[PDB]
Each structure stands twice: as structure tokens, then as C-alpha cells.
Amino acid sequence: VNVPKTRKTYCKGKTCRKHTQHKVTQYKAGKASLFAQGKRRYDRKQSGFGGQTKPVFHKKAKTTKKVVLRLECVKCKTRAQLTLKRCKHFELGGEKKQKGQALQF
Amino acid sequence: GKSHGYRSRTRYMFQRDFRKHGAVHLSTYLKVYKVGDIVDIKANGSIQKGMPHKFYQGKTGVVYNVTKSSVGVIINKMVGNRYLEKRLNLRVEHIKHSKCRQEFLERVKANAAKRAEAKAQGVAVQLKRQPAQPRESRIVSTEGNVPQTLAPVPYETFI
Amino acid sequence: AKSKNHTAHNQTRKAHRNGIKKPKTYKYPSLKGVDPKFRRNHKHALHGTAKALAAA
Amino acid sequence: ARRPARCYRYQKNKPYPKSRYNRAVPDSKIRIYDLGKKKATVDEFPLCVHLVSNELEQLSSEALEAARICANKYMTTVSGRDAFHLRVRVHPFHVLRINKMGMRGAWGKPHGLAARVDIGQIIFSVRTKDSNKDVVVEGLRRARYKFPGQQKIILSKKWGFTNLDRPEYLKKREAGEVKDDGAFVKFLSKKGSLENNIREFPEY
RNA sequence: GUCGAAUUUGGGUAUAGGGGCGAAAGACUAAUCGAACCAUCUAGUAGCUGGUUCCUGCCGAAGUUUCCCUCAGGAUAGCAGAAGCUCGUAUCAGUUUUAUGAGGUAAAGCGAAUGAUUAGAGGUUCCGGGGUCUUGACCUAUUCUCAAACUUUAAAUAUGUAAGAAGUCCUUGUUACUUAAUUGAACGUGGACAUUUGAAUGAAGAGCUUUUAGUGGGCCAUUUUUGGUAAGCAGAACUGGCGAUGCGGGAUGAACCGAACGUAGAGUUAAGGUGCCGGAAUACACGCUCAUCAGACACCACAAAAGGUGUUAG
RNA sequence: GUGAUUUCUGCCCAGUGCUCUGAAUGUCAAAGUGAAGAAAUUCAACCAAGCGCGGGUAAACGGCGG
RNA sequence: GAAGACAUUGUCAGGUGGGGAGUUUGGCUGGGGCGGCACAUCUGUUAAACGAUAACGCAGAUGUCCUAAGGGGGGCUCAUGGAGAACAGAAAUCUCCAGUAGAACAAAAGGGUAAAAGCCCCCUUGAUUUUGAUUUUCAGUGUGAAUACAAACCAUGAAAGUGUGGCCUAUCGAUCCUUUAGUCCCUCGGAAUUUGAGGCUAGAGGUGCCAGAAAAGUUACCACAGGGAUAACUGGCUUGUGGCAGUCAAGCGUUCAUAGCGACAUUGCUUUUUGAUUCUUCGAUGUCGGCUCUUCCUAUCAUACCGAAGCAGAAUUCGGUAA
RNA sequence: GGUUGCGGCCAUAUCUACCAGAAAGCACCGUUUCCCGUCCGAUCAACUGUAGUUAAGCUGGUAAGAGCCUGACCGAGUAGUGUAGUGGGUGACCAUACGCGAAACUCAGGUGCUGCAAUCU
Ligand SMILES: [Cl-]
Ligand SMILES: [Cl-]
Ligand SMILES: [Mg+2]
Ligand SMILES: [Mg+2]
Ligand SMILES: [Mg+2]
Ligand SMILES: [Mg+2]
Ligand SMILES: [Mg+2]
Ligand SMILES: [Mg+2]
Ligand SMILES: [Mg+2]
Ligand SMILES: [Mg+2]
Ligand SMILES: [Mg+2]
Ligand SMILES: [Mg+2]
Ligand SMILES: [Mg+2]
Ligand SMILES: [Mg+2]
Ligand SMILES: [Mg+2]
Ligand SMILES: [Mg+2]
Ligand SMILES: [Mg+2]
Ligand SMILES: [Mg+2]
Ligand SMILES: [Mg+2]
Ligand SMILES: [Mg+2]
Ligand SMILES: [Mg+2]
Ligand SMILES: [Mg+2]
Ligand SMILES: [Mg+2]
Ligand SMILES: [Mg+2]
Ligand SMILES: [Mg+2]
Ligand SMILES: [Mg+2]
Ligand SMILES: [Mg+2]
Ligand SMILES: [Mg+2]
Ligand SMILES: [Mg+2]
Ligand SMILES: [Mg+2]
Ligand SMILES: [Mg+2]
Ligand SMILES: [Mg+2]
Ligand SMILES: [Mg+2]
Ligand SMILES: [Mg+2]
Ligand SMILES: [Mg+2]
Ligand SMILES: [Zn+2]
């Protein structure tokens, strides 16, 4: 699928409260912290004798991940998130469809 | 596996009538519906929005809500050993006024007219419908209508 | 070992022991799902006619 | 390699014709349904004799083929090559299935063709001259042994293969309302434009 | 079998249980060995098998829905009991009627669409091919035969709603909704119309709440119906039964026919019977049948194609 | 491991193991070292054996087709 | 004498470690296994004209694809056939006529659609924000999908209007944890500032056994609880298959259907074959064959008496009464 | 009654082949400076009502016309179907009892009706 890098949409930024211009990017998770409470608990539980104390998922079935777009307002820099359907190939660049031409080579 | 989609088994139910395809006539959109009206549900296959589920095909209900291009209808549905109230949001293309009670209104009007007509002089106006009664006696004349004798006919092949 | 899959035998007889109850009808039914704009004005209309009868 | 006919005698299943859902049906054993002098004029063969079923059953395409050969062979030998017109009035369109090897996945493969006949349904029709009545009746009598169930031979009171009684057909032809069109005829109606109904049937 | 040796054997001594010992068989380790014996943890856990102790009275089931590493088990809804509560025929009904809807099955149809399909006939080519005229291909008018996943038409049986007081009519109050507009919408004040008050029949009263048992292997018969050559086979639909049920009948039999049960007396019947067994006419009446394998009563305990100057009627 | 004597024990080191006075800038723990921050901390460089790479080995396990 | 701050020993860290320990090693299923997915879903049919309805029934499909193939507006009309135009031919481009859709609409199928829902062109991001109600599966829980409004902000068009993704019917995911956005709000409990951590609201990372445990084999050394709810013998139902017997008569037989045979078809019988089924038995009915011994059936190999022949004799062949 | 604008039901209105049409209306028709749109002022836009024509559109009538519509004790109380019997039949299936009741076929008739506004021998 092809999605433009710019889109006009509602901005609930307490100063816009209306449709504004937004920059479009792709969401990325980010590194997990070593001092999150869930991480601190896991390290304590895993220490000592007893082996692995939590399940480890193996039976993967999905072949795709949902794409999330991060929309940043150009005026107030307020971010928003949108989720698209599952797809195998995703791009943000241009190269729009040509209406009709001869198939080269 | 089995298939139980929303429009399952509706191959013939939602089809248009023969030589009756195309756009809907304007009289469908000009009728007015009010809360308390009695309507019956018949889906139109050419209008995919606001279409009822196949269960409510051929059912009759009472309007409870009026919106821009649709009405709200109440249907009593039998589930298990009881009846549950169902509320439907249907566009006007799929409904029409029911005549199961419009014919009843004129009987109320005629009862009042007959009651007032006999009020000044008559008693026992008898404003109750009665079932068909056994025929009374009559005399059948044979003048020009002498009975014709009939007999069973023999078996013939005539193939 | 294979067993039976499905049947509706005896189900109607069970439903008729105490069932088939027509729904109870009430005056003043619930206004759930009614158009919010109509209900906003209907509330104001009822307050106005309450004052008139009380002050009559 | 073929099961006995008692295994498929009765109409137990719904009709199962050759279609885009089968696509693998073998050909029928009978391919010719008109025998004798099929070019004969309607006025040539006034007498009609039928072989009529008296049971609700199925007739295999092998049985139809065998009975057709027996009837044609006898009548040709006795009466003559061009002295009758024999028509088979049943076409085998029902496909039979056979389960070849427990009961898991028992849906069978196509096995053959059969024709589903009703009570009083015509199976064979023969038209010939009046003087040739006894020959064609005996030919149909010998064909009954190839079929299961009970069949009856009835002398029709129609004119040949037409749907009109013999006196009624004679009435129309003397009025110039019958035109010969191949082996069959066309009739003149009271409807339609006179411009077409005049060039046809000029004698009327 | 072996019998002077890798011989046989007494006593002493060493190796102890995931250990020992084994010229190796998972062999032997006190009648115990693919991990000894003894006591304790220990009344170890079991969706699995067995058993579970007095009487009478009243009511009285389920093998079905959804979810579960769920398929010999549970939860959940249903069916059942008990406790009642609010009321006193209000209103309701496994039913009919009248008025008004919905459906695409049985049947029917193919010189109606789609798809199959037999046979000619009249026409058509600078647009199939042999030959200087034939077979194919379409065109037009006809003709024989078909469809669970074809159809114009279209039942029967089932199925939605309505038949009044929460109704109808006359007048005019409220609003921030709606209208060009006191226009409309919705909800109200006041007046008029009583139970032949708006069809039939019935109604050991109607409405309502809490709580909890068992059950969640079913099976059979008529009709509809799928797979299979078929099955006392496998799987569905509606209803009635068995299971949970004796009693009269079918000799005998869970399901068929009749009929359902407090203790007795009398009378009358059901289904089935009345030569004898065996309660009841070796009754009445018109015919048919003679078998050197007659026949004899639904479910049901089998017989066919094809034949006979046997006999009878047509 | 094979199993007196006699006679003979062929070809295959790609795979799985075993082995090497082989190579270096692959992967790489704790401690230690550096930078940043007010600190908790974070990042980076360096980095043992093993692994990887290279050689040897079938009377090692095994293989000997179209 | 040797050896020396190195070995050794102590504590952490990385590797190696079936030598050893603990545990696991789906379900449905005409027994189980192998296969398959009927395990989460969609179209048509089976389905018996409301709704609901089974089988490892029948014919297929889904874990995708699209900045347009989404939204609005305008103009236009398709498949196919006929008659024509240099190269040009059955198929290149141009013109006219006929054309109810026989085209097209991402995909399976069924519906739907013609001044359109199809084709071309112009403009756009409503595939947006907040939080409720409703329909389907249903326990009237969840999840998925879908319908109609309310309050905002926008797109398009002269305008009425239309638009909360794809013409409609499938295209998908809890708790815990992690992470992002929002609000910059609440808490760190002796009092404050700044980091850090923890909460509130909305998404993402996935469980396909799809209401969602983290999981390899073998036992012919075997164990226990059970099961005739379920397989390996008889018996019972069935008879496809096996075996046996009729009917018809095109033909074989030098002539000549039927002495003896007999195609194409068709009706049965038998339980001495094998399947199908799973009713009885798993707190046990001793399991192949032979040996020994008795009796029964007749579909008769021999013996008794007969009929028939393409029966001269001889020999043989067909049939009857007969166990 | 004719005609025009906007309609309702959506073939009794459609289709094929012909014939006729006073008045007005509608239409064809004339032109390219302007707004506007095309390869083409053909379509679309604008201007004139002047130069012409009822030829076509349009409306009506005609046809043992096709289609369509309505009715018929035409077919037919037939096919099918609810309920019942210890009815028939080896079976396949069938008859009867109390009810409901088609389609094709055949024949006959019909060939748009109508609402609002304006206008015309
Ligand atoms: Cl049951
Ligand atoms: Cl010891
Ligand atoms: Mg540790
Ligand atoms: Mg949509
Ligand atoms: Mg069960
Ligand atoms: Mg038979
Ligand atoms: Mg089969
Ligand atoms: Mg010794
Ligand atoms: Mg061993
Ligand atoms: Mg105990
Ligand atoms: Mg114990
Ligand atoms: Mg009781
Ligand atoms: Mg048990
Ligand atoms: Mg259907
Ligand atoms: Mg039919
Ligand atoms: Mg149980
Ligand atoms: Mg069973
Ligand atoms: Mg029991
Ligand atoms: Mg008996
Ligand atoms: Mg006696
Ligand atoms: Mg040696
Ligand atoms: Mg140490
Ligand atoms: Mg182990
Ligand atoms: Mg299993
Ligand atoms: Mg249905
Ligand atoms: Mg689209
Ligand atoms: Mg503190
Ligand atoms: Mg699940
Ligand atoms: Mg798991
Ligand atoms: Mg059993
Ligand atoms: Mg056989
Ligand atoms: Mg015993
Ligand atoms: Mg014994
Ligand atoms: Mg024993
Ligand atoms: Mg009965
Ligand atoms: Zn902003």
C-alpha cells in the first residue's frame, strides 16, 4: 500500500481544534527499559535455581504486523496515531499510479 | 466448515421482482411515518444501506423513532421460551405502511356513526361482527330448470 | 467413539411447560435510542407545561 | 465389472445430471433415438403404437440400447426396412454412482446413466401403416423382456405422432390447413398477419 | 553333557539399593529385581469401578443450547421441587374466524432466459473443406426429452400483525426541536362516547420473585429426508412414544394396537376374538379354491421375472 | 573394536564426531578502563576460553547412485 | 632436595556437560494409526417456500489487495453482431446501424447496478475527533463485522444533497508484560526541588488448537485405573463381491435359435468367499492346521431305475426320481 | 378536445411496418463579437426569432401484427398437498374417507389512465 507523507485531518491540540496539516511517519516500538517494574520483577524471579520461570511463546501464526502511522501537527506539534489494516508491503514515498500507459518491455 | 454469514441463505429472498429492477419510485420517499405507526418489513435488494437482517423479512412492528432517512421499529422476537424486544434502524425503502389496522380504523368510524344514528330511537345497535351463519330455508323452482341426470363414465385411454 | 451431533427433539415440549410468554406492555415505554435532539427539546417542553399547570 | 440392475432400479436419490459440478460422466450406451424411415411423411404412417411404463423406476442406458436393437431387428426382418418409424421417447440424464473400495468418505464416482420414468409415461413410439399393426406390436412385445418392471402396449387413437385424433386430422387436411415441413407438419391458425398466413396455405 | 581342569567345594573376608555384582540373560542381590526389604510422610491423588441401612403421602425430569487441551468431565441456559408474594377474573391461549403481510418447496415450464438434448425442413458465404457441387458452420420456422447447486408462473401444510378505555372525536396549553409562517412534532388541560365495549371457544384464577436437586451417553415408530448395493447401518426435520409404565390384545417381544393404575361391588365396552385347547354362534348369506411341499390376519419374522386348454369371470 | 589358523582387507574426510606446534581482527561474560550526567545510570572501546574459519583423521560413526 | 609469589585454595563470571535429575511429548476420527481439517470463518446447495437444523455430505473460497480500487461532482455507455475505409489478412485503426446488459465492478460464489454502482476527466482525504444506542453469532457474555443518530471539524457540488473506508454478504485476537500517543493531570505516605519510578484515557507487539498451557521419541522388559461407550474370533442384520440358478433369443452348430451352446439385456437364490456394520462378550466363551469320532444338508462324483441326443455299436454328453 | 412545463402509477404506456396532423405550442433551422467547451460551434455555451420547413422529432390512427394486460365451471376440481384406517399390493407404488387446491394449454376482450399550472378556433 502507498500512503502520502502529508495529510490534512482533525487536530485535538487545544489550540487547533480543527483540520490542520500533519506530517506522516511510521511508528516504531522503541527499546525496553531495564528499570520498568515488570522488568525488575522478572529479573528477581529468574535469579537463583529453578530455571525458566515464565512461558516463552513459540507457536507463531501471523505473517504480518499492523502498520501504525504517527501524525504530527505542523502548528502545535501535537502527535496522533492511526492504525491501518494488515499488509505485507508498506511505503510512504511517492510514485503514484499512472492512469494508463503501455507496458514497457 | 459451515458458513453462517450475515446474508447467508438469502439468494432468492433479496432478489428484485421480475421486470421490476432499477431505481425506486418516488412514492416510497414521499410517505410520512410517525411514532406509533404500524409498518411491515420487506427488504429491497438494490439499497444496500440500512437493510434488515433476513429474520425480520415479512415481520410487522411499531415505529418508535424517526430520523433523517430512516425509522426505528420495535419487533418482538421469540428466543427460547420467551419473547425479547428488538429495535431496528431501517431506511424507508425497506418498509411500508401496514393495512392490517388501516382497515380497522373505518370499522371504528362506522360504529360511531351507527351508534349515533340509532341513539335517538334504537336500542341494541349490535356493533359486533359475527361469523358466517348457516343458511336459512329456501325454495328451488324447476320452471325451466328440470334436473339433468348424470351417470359415471366408462374408462377410456385416449392416449 | 462417536456420539450424536445435534437434534431439536423434545425442545418445543420443554419450551411449552412454562414458556411462550407474550411480553408485558407498559404505558410510557423507555425512550432508549430516541433521537437526542428530540429528547433535549422534549425535556424543556415538559418543564414548561409543568409550571403552567402548577401556577394555574 | 457392472453391477446387476437391481442395485439401481428405484428413484431413491434426487436427479444427478451431468453438469459443471460432475464433469466426469461417461457417455451413454444409446446414441440413436430415431430408427426406420424417419423421413416419412405424416400422411404415410397414420397408425401409432406405444410402449407405456406402468411403474415408477429407472431404466439403464444399456437396457434402452438392448431393447431398441431387438425391436428394430425384428420389425426390419418381417415387415421391411422402410415400413415404420421407431422413436425412443426417454433420454438417460440421471448419473448413477458407485462406491469402490469403511464408510468414511463413501461418496461414489459416476458409474452409468439411467432414465427416470413415471407411471403412464411413453417409452417407445412406432408409427406405421394400419396393415402393419401386428408386426410392430410383436416387436414391442419382444422389447419388454429387456426392461425391468411392467410395461403395456396401447393402440393410440391419434394420427401418427401428431397430437390430434384421426378424424380431427382428416378434417384439417381436407381444408388445406396442413403443410408438410420435413417429417412433421405445420398448421394454420386464426391469428397473425394475413400477409404471412396467405402465402402459407394458398389452398385455404 | 562334563569328569585333572577357565575343575568342584567348606569356613574366613570384602563389595549395599540409582548402589553393588555381572565369561552380559536386564541376569543375580534371602521363594522379592527393567531398581530389594522395613517404618514413616500417608486416610498420598483419582474426570475411573464397586457399595451407600425405616415407612407412607404429594409433585416430578434430562440426554438439548453456548464456552472449555472440552469428547467417560465441568461451567451456562432449559426442564423439576420447595418457599411464597401482589392481587381476585382483571387478562391470557401449542385453537378457529375475519382483515392484511411475508416465502420460492411440491407441482409445473423449455415453439420463456441459462445450461443439457433427438430428428428433419426452408434459407445464407469475396468468411470451413472436398469437389464444380456434397458434408460441416451459423440464420429462421418446427420437433423428441431433462436439471439439488436452472426459471417466467406457483400451491398444500407451517408463519408475522390487527380485531379499542393505554380507544375515537371536538376545543386549545408548553418547548431551547421543526416550519416562509401558531406550520408541524411530541406531551398535556377541558368536554362528549360504557361493558352486543367492538369476532368465535375456553380459562381447578392472573401476575411476580427468590432459591436449589437431578440431567447434559439416549433409543424407537409414522411422514419428510442425506450418504451407502444394502444393513436390526450412519446422519438430520415435525410429532408421538420407550427410557421413567403396569393393565387388555399381537402365542412369545422396552417402542405396535387399545387404554394409562388409590381400595372394592355392579353394569357396559376398546383393540382382539367366539371347532377344541379357551371365556364367546361347528351362526346366517353370495361366491372362489383341491396343492405327490394348499392356505390361514397390520408392525412381523420374505419371495421375483417369466409361464399353465387347471378352474372362474371379463 | 574384531574374534583360531590360511588368504585378503578396495574406494569415500562432503555430513556427524575426534584432533591440530594452524589463521586472525568475525562472535564475545564478569571485573577493569573511557566519555556524558548533580547522581542513580547510559553509551563506547578493549576483550579469556569456546564457537566460526583452515588442516588431519574411516581396523571413528558411517556411505559406495542416477 | 624440588618448587615459588607461579601452582594451590576461597568467591563470582563465560564455555562445556543424556554422565545424571525433573518434566512434556494436542483434538476431531464408522477402533487406533497414516492422511485430511469437517478446530476460527465466507458463498451456493443438501434444508422439507418464516427462522433454526446433522454427517470425514456436494461444488468452491479466506489469513490478502487498494492514496485509490476511498469521498464528492461532471460527461459518457458496455458484451456481441451486421454493413463499410490504402497497405490491412478471422484479430491493428476509422464510420454508421442494431444491441435489457448476453459487459464491467481486485478476489470464491450468490445478490445488486445503465443520463450507474460500469468507462473517462476534475477536485479531494470523512480511511478524521469525542462518547453512547442498535443488528448478527448469543448465555441475549465477549470478539469480529455491520446499521441509525447526537456533538465537532472538513471534502465535494450551482444546489438539493452525499461522505464515520472499499456496491452487499468473509478477510481476524483477552488477562499479565512491554511500548507509543494524550492529559502535563494524580502518587512516591516526616517536608521540599530536580531525575527516576508508579497511575488515569486511547492504540500497537499474539496467542491459526484462532474465549488465547511454555513442550521430542521408544518400550517385543513393562505397570495401574477403567472400557464391550472401542479393534483383533464365533453368532446376528446386509449381499456389493464370491458362489449357484432362471427369463428373452441376435447368433454358434454343413443345412437347422433352443441335441449341446448362446451375445446384448433382465429376474432371483445361497451364506461353504471377502467386505460393510459394531448389537452381545475385555472382574477372559482357550487362537491356525492335522489326528480321532458321530450326525446332518443336496446344488449327485459312484452305485439302482429312467427320459433326451447331431444316441448304429462302443464311448460320452444333457436331464429326472433319488443322500 | 389540441399543445407546453413539472409529475403520479411505471408496456393497456413497449416494439415492427405504414398513414395522417387546422390553430397554437414544441421542434428542426440561421449566426459566431461576447461568457464557455471541443481534433471538429457535431455535442455543449452565447446571440437573433430574423432567412426557411412540417421532412424528421413529437402526437394520433391503421394491422385475422409481436409483446403486454384482464377475464373465463377453457383445461381442471386434473397435478400436488394436510389429516385417517390392523385399507390394497412381494415390492415399486396405488385406491378410498374428511379438507385445501395449481401451472401450462385453449378461448374472449383490451392497447395508457390521470394530478398541478399555462396556452390555443
Ligand atoms: Cl432424541
Ligand atoms: Cl545396608
Ligand atoms: Mg544464578
Ligand atoms: Mg459499506
Ligand atoms: Mg451427547
Ligand atoms: Mg430388481
Ligand atoms: Mg455411491
Ligand atoms: Mg567352583
Ligand atoms: Mg532383552
Ligand atoms: Mg476415604
Ligand atoms: Mg491409599
Ligand atoms: Mg404426577
Ligand atoms: Mg461408566
Ligand atoms: Mg431454496
Ligand atoms: Mg420438481
Ligand atoms: Mg455422563
Ligand atoms: Mg449406533
Ligand atoms: Mg437411564
Ligand atoms: Mg405373532
Ligand atoms: Mg367355550
Ligand atoms: Mg582369523
Ligand atoms: Mg573455589
Ligand atoms: Mg533423562
Ligand atoms: Mg483421539
Ligand atoms: Mg428456512
Ligand atoms: Mg468503489
Ligand atoms: Mg517516605
Ligand atoms: Mg477454542
Ligand atoms: Mg500451548
Ligand atoms: Mg457394542
Ligand atoms: Mg453376484
Ligand atoms: Mg465370568
Ligand atoms: Mg468352555
Ligand atoms: Mg473359562
Ligand atoms: Mg393410529
Ligand atoms: Zn495542531
UniProtKB/Swiss-Prot annotation, chain A:
Which keywords does this Swiss-Prot/TrEMBL entry list?
A: Antibiotic resistance, Cycloheximide resistance, Cytoplasm, Methylation, Ribonucleoprotein, Ribosomal protein
Q: Is Ribosomal protein a UniProt keyword of this protein?
A: yes
Q: Name one GO cellular component term.
A: cytosol
Q: Note whether NADP occurs among the keywords.
A: no
Q: What's the chief localization of this chain?
A: cytoplasm
UniProt-listed PANTHER family: 60S RIBOSOMAL PROTEIN L36A/L44
Q: What does this protein do?
A: Component of the ribosome, a large ribonucleoprotein complex responsible for the synthesis of proteins in the cell. The small ribosomal subunit (SSU) binds messenger RNAs (mRNAs) and translates the encoded message by selecting cognate aminoacyl-transfer RNA (tRNA) molecules. The large subunit (LSU) contains the ribosomal catalytic site termed the peptidyl transferase center (PTC), which catalyzes the formation of peptide bonds, thereby polymerizing the amino acids delivered by tRNAs into a polypeptide chain.
Q: What else is known?
A: Present with 13600 molecules/cell in log phase SD medium. There are 2 genes for eL42 in yeast.
**Which protein is depicted?**
Large ribosomal subunit protein eL42A
Look up and give the organism this protein is from: Saccharomyces cerevisiae (strain ATCC 204508 / S288c)
Tell me the name of the encoding gene: RPL42A
Swiss-Prot record, chain B:
- Its main subcellular localisation, reduced to a broad class, is cytoplasm
Q: Glycyl lysine isopeptide (Lys-Gly) (interchain with G-Cter in ubiquitin): where is this cross-link?
A: 31
- Coiled coil (UniProt feature): none
Q: Please name the GO terms of the biological process aspect recorded for this protein, alphabetically.
A: cytoplasmic translation
Domain of life of the source:
Eukaryota
Q: Output the Gene Ontology terms for molecular function.
A: structural constituent of ribosome
Question: GO CC: one term?
Answer: cytosol
Subcellular localization, as worded in the UniProt entry = Cytoplasm
Q: Which Pfam families does the protein's record reference?
A: Ribosomal_L21e (PF01157)
For this UniProt record, give its keywords in alphabetical order, as a comma-separated list.
Cytoplasm, Isopeptide bond, Ribonucleoprotein, Ribosomal protein, Ubl conjugation
Quote the subunit structure annotation.
Answer: Component of the large ribosomal subunit (LSU). Mature yeast ribosomes consist of a small (40S) and a large (60S) subunit. The 40S small subunit contains 1 molecule of ribosomal RNA (18S rRNA) and 33 different proteins (encoded by 57 genes). The large 60S subunit contains 3 rRNA molecules (25S, 5.8S and 5S rRNA) and 46 different proteins (encoded by 81 genes).
Question: Function, please?
Answer: Component of the ribosome, a large ribonucleoprotein complex responsible for the synthesis of proteins in the cell. The small ribosomal subunit (SSU) binds messenger RNAs (mRNAs) and translates the encoded message by selecting cognate aminoacyl-transfer RNA (tRNA) molecules. The large subunit (LSU) contains the ribosomal catalytic site termed the peptidyl transferase center (PTC), which catalyzes the formation of peptide bonds, thereby polymerizing the amino acids delivered by tRNAs into a polypeptide chain.
Give the protein family.
Belongs to the eukaryotic ribosomal protein eL21 family.
Task: State any further remark.
Answer: There are 2 genes for eL21 in yeast.
Q: Under what name is this protein listed?
A: Large ribosomal subunit protein eL21A
The gene is RPL21A
From Swiss-Prot, chain C:
User: What are this entry's molecular-function GO terms?
Assistant: structural constituent of ribosome
Primary place of residence? cytoplasm
Biased-composition ranges for Basic residues? 1-25
Provide the leader sequence positions: none
Q: GO BP, one example?
A: cytoplasmic translation
Its subcellular locations are: Cytoplasm
**Could you confirm whether the keyword Protease appears in this record?**
no
Q: Where is this cross-link: Glycyl lysine isopeptide (Lys-Gly) (interchain with G-Cter in ubiquitin)?
A: 51
Write down any Gene Ontology CC term: cytoplasm
Task: Provide this UniProt record's keywords sorted from A to Z.
Answer: Cytoplasm, Isopeptide bond, Ribonucleoprotein, Ribosomal protein, Ubl conjugation
Remaining remarks: Present with 51100 molecules/cell in log phase SD medium.
Oligomeric and partner information: Component of the large ribosomal subunit (LSU). Mature yeast ribosomes consist of a small (40S) and a large (60S) subunit. The 40S small subunit contains 1 molecule of ribosomal RNA (18S rRNA) and 33 different proteins (encoded by 57 genes). The large 60S subunit contains 3 rRNA molecules (25S, 5.8S and 5S rRNA) and 46 different proteins (encoded by 81 genes).
Instruction: Give a short account of what the protein does.
Output: Component of the ribosome, a large ribonucleoprotein complex responsible for the synthesis of proteins in the cell. The small ribosomal subunit (SSU) binds messenger RNAs (mRNAs) and translates the encoded message by selecting cognate aminoacyl-transfer RNA (tRNA) molecules. The large subunit (LSU) contains the ribosomal catalytic site termed the peptidyl transferase center (PTC), which catalyzes the formation of peptide bonds, thereby polymerizing the amino acids delivered by tRNAs into a polypeptide chain.
Q: What is this protein called?
A: Large ribosomal subunit protein eL29
Organism, by scientific name, is Saccharomyces cerevisiae (strain ATCC 204508 / S288c)
Swiss-Prot record, chain D:
Task: Tell me the segments the record calls region 2 X 15-17 AA approximate repeats.
Answer: 155-204
Keyword annotations for this protein, in alphabetical order, are: Cytoplasm, Isopeptide bond, Phosphoprotein, Repeat, Ribonucleoprotein, Ribosomal protein, Ubl conjugation
Which coarse location class describes where this protein primarily resides? Answer: cytoplasm
- State any single GO MF term: structural constituent of ribosome
Q: Where is the cross-link described as Glycyl lysine isopeptide (Lys-Gly) (interchain with G-Cter in ubiquitin)?
A: 39, 100
sequence repeat locations: 155-169, 188-204
Gene Ontology cellular-component annotations: cytoplasm; cytosol; cytosolic large ribosomal subunit
CDD domains, per this entry?
A: Ribosomal_L16_L10e
Biological process terms in GO annotation: cytoplasmic translation; ribosomal large subunit assembly; translation; translational termination
Q: Which InterPro entries match?
A: Ribosomal_uL16 (IPR047873), Ribosomal_uL16_CS_euk_arc (IPR018255), Ribosomal_uL16_dom (IPR016180), Ribosomal_uL16_euk_arch (IPR001197), Ribosomal_uL16_sf (IPR036920)
Mark the residues carrying the PTM Phosphoserine.
131, 193
Q: Which family does it belong to?
A: Belongs to the universal ribosomal protein uL16 family.
Tell me, in a sentence or two, what this protein's role is.
Component of the ribosome, a large ribonucleoprotein complex responsible for the synthesis of proteins in the cell. The small ribosomal subunit (SSU) binds messenger RNAs (mRNAs) and translates the encoded message by selecting cognate aminoacyl-transfer RNA (tRNA) molecules. The large subunit (LSU) contains the ribosomal catalytic site termed the peptidyl transferase center (PTC), which catalyzes the formation of peptide bonds, thereby polymerizing the amino acids delivered by tRNAs into a polypeptide chain.
By what name is this protein known?
Large ribosomal subunit protein uL16
| Organism for this UniProt entry | Saccharomyces cerevisiae (strain ATCC 204508 / S288c) (Baker's yeast)
